[PDB]
Every structure is written in C-alpha cells, then in structure tokens.
XYZ file of C-alpha atoms in Angstrom:
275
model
C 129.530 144.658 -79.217
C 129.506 141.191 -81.002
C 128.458 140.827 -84.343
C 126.147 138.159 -86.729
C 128.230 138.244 -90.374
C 125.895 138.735 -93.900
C 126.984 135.336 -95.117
C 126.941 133.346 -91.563
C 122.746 133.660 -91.142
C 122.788 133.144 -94.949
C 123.664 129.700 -95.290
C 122.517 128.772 -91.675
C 124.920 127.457 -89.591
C 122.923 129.248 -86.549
C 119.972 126.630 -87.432
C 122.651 123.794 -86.431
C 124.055 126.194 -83.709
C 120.714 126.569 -81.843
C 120.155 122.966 -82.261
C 123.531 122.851 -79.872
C 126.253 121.780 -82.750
C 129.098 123.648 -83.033
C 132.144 121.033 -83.841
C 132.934 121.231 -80.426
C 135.350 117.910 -81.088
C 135.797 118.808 -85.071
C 139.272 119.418 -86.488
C 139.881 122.145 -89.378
C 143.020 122.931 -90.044
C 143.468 126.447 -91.344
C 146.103 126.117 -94.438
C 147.335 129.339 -94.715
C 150.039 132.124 -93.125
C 148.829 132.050 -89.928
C 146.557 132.556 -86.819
C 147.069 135.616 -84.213
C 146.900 134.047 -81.037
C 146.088 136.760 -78.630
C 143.276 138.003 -80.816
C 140.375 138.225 -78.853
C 137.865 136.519 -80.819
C 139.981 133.090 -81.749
C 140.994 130.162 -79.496
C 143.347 128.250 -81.443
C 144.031 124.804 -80.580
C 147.286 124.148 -82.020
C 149.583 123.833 -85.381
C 152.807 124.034 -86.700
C 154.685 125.395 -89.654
C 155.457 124.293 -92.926
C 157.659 127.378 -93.884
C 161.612 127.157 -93.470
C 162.051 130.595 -91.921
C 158.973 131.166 -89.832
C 159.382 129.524 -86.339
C 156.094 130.592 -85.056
C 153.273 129.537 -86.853
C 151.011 132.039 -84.404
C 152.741 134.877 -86.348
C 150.299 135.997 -89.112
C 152.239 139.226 -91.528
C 150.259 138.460 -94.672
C 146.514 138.436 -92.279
C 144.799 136.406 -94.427
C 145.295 133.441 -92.009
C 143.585 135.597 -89.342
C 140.842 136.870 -91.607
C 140.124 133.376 -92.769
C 140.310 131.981 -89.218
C 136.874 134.091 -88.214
C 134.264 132.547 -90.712
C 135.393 129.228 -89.498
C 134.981 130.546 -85.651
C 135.500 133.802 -84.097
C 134.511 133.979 -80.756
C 131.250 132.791 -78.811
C 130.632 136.140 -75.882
C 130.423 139.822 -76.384
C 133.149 141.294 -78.582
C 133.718 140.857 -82.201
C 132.066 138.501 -84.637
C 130.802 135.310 -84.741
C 132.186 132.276 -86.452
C 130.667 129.476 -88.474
C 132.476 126.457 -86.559
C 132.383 128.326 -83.558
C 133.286 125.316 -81.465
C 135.580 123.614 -83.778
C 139.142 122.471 -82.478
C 141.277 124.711 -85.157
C 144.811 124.211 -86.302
C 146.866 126.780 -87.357
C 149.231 125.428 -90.189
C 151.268 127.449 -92.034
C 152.575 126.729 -95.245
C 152.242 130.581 -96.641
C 154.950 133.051 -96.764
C 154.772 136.085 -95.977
C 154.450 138.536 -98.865
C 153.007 135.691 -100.830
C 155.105 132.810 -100.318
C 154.333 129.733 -103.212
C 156.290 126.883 -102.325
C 154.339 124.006 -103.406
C 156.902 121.879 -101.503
C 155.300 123.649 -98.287
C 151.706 123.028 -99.178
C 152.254 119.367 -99.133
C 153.986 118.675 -95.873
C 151.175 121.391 -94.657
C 148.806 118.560 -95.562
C 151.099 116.166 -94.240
C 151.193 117.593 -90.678
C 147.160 117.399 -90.872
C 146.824 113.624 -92.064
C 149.236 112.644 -89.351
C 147.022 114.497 -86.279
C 143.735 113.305 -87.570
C 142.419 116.657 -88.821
C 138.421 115.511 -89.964
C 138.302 119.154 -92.271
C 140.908 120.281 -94.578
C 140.797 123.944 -95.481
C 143.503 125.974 -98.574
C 141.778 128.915 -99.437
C 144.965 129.471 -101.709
C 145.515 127.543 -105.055
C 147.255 128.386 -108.371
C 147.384 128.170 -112.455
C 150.220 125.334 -112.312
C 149.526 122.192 -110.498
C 151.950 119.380 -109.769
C 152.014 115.658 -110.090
C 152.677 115.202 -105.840
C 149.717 117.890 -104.801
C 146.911 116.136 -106.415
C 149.045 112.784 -104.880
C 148.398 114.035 -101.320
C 145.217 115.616 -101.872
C 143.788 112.320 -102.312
C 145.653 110.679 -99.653
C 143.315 113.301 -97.141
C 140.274 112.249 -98.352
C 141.548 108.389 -98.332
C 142.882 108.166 -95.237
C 139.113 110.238 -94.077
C 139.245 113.901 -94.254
C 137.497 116.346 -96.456
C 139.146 118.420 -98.163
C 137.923 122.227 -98.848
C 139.329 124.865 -101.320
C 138.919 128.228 -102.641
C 138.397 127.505 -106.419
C 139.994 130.745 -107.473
C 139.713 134.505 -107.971
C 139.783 134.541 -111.877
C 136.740 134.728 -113.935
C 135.823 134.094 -117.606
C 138.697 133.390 -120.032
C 137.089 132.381 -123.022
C 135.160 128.947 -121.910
C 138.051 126.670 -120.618
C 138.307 126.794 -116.787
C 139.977 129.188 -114.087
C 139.579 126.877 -111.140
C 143.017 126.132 -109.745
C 144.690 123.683 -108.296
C 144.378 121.935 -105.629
C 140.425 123.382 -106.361
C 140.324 121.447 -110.017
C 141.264 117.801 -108.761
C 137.732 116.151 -108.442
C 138.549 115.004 -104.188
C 138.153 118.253 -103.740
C 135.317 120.570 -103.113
C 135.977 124.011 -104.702
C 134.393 126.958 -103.250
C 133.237 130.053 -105.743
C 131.643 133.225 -104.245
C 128.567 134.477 -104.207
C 126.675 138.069 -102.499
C 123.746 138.271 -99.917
C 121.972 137.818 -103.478
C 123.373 134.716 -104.718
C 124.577 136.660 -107.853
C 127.796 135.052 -108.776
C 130.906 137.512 -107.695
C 132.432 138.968 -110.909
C 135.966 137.351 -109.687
C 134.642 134.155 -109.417
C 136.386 131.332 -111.279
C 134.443 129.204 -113.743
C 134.913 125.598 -114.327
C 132.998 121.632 -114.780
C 135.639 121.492 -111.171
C 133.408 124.171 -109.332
C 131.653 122.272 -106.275
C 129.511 124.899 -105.270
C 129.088 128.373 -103.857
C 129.464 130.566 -100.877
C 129.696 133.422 -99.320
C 132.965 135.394 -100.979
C 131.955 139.806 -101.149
C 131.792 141.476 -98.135
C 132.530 138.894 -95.994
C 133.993 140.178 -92.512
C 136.114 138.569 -90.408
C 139.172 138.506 -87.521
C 142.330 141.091 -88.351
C 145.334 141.007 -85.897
C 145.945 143.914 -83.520
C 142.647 143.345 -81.694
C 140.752 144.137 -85.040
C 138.218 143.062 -87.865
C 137.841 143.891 -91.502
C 136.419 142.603 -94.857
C 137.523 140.543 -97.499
C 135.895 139.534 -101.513
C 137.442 136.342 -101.976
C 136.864 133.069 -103.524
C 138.905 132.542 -99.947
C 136.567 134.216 -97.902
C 133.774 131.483 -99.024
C 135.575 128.487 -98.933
C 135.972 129.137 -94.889
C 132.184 129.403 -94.867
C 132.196 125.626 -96.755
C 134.611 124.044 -94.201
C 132.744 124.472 -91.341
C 129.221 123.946 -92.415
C 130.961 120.985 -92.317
C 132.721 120.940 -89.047
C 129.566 120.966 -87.573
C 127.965 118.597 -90.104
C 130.485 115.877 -89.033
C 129.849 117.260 -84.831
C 126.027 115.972 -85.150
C 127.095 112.770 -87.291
C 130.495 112.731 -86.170
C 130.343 109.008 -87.166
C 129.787 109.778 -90.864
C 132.101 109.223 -93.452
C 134.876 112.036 -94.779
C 132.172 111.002 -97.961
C 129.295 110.702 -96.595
C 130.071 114.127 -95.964
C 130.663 115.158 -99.487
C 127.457 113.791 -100.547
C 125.269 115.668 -98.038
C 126.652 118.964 -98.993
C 126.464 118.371 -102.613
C 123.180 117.565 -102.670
C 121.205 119.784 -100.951
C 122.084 123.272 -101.311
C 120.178 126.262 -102.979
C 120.510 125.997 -107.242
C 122.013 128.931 -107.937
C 122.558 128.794 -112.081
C 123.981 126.866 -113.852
C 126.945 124.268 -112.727
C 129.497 125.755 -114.672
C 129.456 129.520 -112.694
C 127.238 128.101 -109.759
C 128.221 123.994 -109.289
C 125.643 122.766 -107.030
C 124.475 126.365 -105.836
C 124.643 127.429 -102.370
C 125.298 124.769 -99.186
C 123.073 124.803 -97.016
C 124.089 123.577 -93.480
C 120.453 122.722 -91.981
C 119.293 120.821 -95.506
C 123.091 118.770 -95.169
C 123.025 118.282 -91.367
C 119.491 117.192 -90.773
C-alpha cells in the first residue's frame, strides 16, 4: 500500500508532521529535469523550463527529477511513499537535459525563474568540478533577496585532502548536502570538503519513478531532497523566520556525526531545528 522511507523517520520530519506542519504554503522548487505529472504520488504546483528544446517542463526522460521530487513529498493517502514536505507547494523547473544536459547558462535563469515567483526553498541536487563567476553571482542573490538555498555537495570522495564538493555546493550561501546510511556511516561516494554543511540521507533512499512507479537511488542527490524540506516545513511553523534564521537552526542542531570535514555539522534534525 503506502510506504514510510528508511531516511524519512530517520531525521524526523513525521515529529513536525504529527505536530500538523507540512509546508502546506512552502515553496521548493525542484532544480532538475523534471516532474511526471500524472504520477500518482506527486501534486505539482507549477514550473517552467530553462532548457531551449524541452517545451514541457512536466516531461521527465533523465527521472531523476521524479525520483528527487518524492523525498521532498510524495503523496499523503494509500499508494506509494511518503514525502518529507508532504504539503509543500513544489515547482518543477527544469534546467537539466536530458541525457545529462550541463548548460550552466540554464542553471542560472533556472534560479532566475525561482527568485522572481518567491520560491522560500531552493533545491540543485546537481553541481560540477568547474564553477563560474555568474553561478556563485546568483546563488547569492537567492539567499539575499530571502530564499535558502540547498545542494547536493557531490558524489566524489577522497582525492588526496583538497575538496570534492562542487559547485554551486562549495560557495559558503549554500548548504551542501553529503550522504549518510540508516547508520550515519558516511557513504563511500560522499564528497569531502571545509564547504560540506551537513549530512543526510543519500544510500538506499527510495523515491517516485514515472510510469506509475518507485525505485531507489545512492546519491549525494538523494539527501539533499531530504535537507530542503526539513526545511519547508521548518519555515511552515515559523513561516515568519528569516531565509537565515533558517540556516542557523539547521546548522546547529543536528546529530554530530564525525568530524566536519566528511560529516559538517552531522545529521539535521527537523524536530531539534523546528521546535
């Protein structure tokens, strides 16, 4: 029937869902390929696309949109899974292509697009090596203007001791997401870096598939969608709070995992960071 996730109950979103917060008037804005609209579990509330060639931006090839989509908030009934912003208002913007589609030029209007509709949670769980001058330009206009902005930090590991976090992850207005198991062992694919926030749920984590389907993802981009929405719903019981008062709640009271430079902070805990 319908489905609690590992990593959902092990953070605790349910402990601010049974207190009746869900971000029922919270925006995220999934930055990604895209957002199956008839799937069963989602209600999407609207989008657009940042990719030349892709009219719809409800047309998901690459699924990671999708997949991603579901810890933030699958469903609320008796089919699938269930979501960690489960009430959040949730815009699909595209800036992916499919196949794997880079264009930094896409990723910025994708913000763009957000700033201009008031989105109050930013989520990329993409990122790269290279950065750019403009993307660490707009990436602070989000948090200026109010919104937080939430990354995957990367899927790379050690390299010596200099850092794997990518970009946007690695520019400080950003919180960068690593992954951890049910254990809070750090996932072997986990970047490393003094630019790691803190860490989530990234093995195992299953979520929303087009075709009226589920599956499972390891991902540094499979925690960061946990991250966003402990916040969602941070921001629905003090939707008043600041995009940084925000920050500060969630770095500050998690679970120490080990130290900062494979861990951050440790683990967010929504119920410590809500109140």
């Amino acid at each position: 029937a319908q489905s609690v996730p590992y990593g959902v109950s092990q953070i605790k979103a349910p402990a601010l869902h049974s207190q009746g917060y869900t971000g029922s008037n919270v925006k995220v804005a999934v930055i990604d390929s895209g957002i199956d609209s008839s799937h069963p579990d989602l209600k999407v509330a609207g989008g657009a696309s940042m990719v030349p060639s892709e009219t719809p931006n409800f047309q998901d090839d690459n699924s990671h949109g999708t997949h991603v989509a579901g810890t933030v908030a699958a469903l609320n009934n008796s089919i699938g899974v269930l979501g960690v912003a489960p009430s959040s208002a949730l815009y699909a913007v595209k800036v992916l292509g499919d196949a794997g589609s880079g264009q930094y030029s896409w990723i910025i209007n994708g913000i763009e697009w957000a700033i201009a509709n008031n989105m109050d949670v930013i989520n990329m769980s993409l990122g790269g090596p290279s950065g750019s001058a403009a993307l660490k330009a707009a990436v602070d206009k989000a948090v200026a203007s109010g919104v937080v902005v939430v990354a995957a930090a990367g899927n790379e590991g050690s390299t010596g001791s200099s850092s794997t976090v990518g970009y946007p992850g690695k520019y400080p207005s950003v919180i960068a997401v690593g992954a951890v198991d049910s254990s809070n062992q750090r996932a072997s694919f986990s970047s490393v870096g003094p630019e790691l926030d803190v860490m989530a749920p990234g093995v195992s984590i299953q979520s929303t598939l087009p075709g009226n389907k589920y599956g499972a993802y390891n991902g540094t981009s499979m925690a960061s969608p946990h991250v966003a929405g402990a916040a969602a719903l941070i921001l629905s019981k003090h939707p008043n709070w600041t995009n940084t008062q925000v920050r500060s709640s969630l770095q500050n009271t998690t679970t120490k995992l080990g130290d900062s430079f494979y861990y951050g902070k440790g683990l967010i805990n929504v119920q410590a960071a809500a109140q």
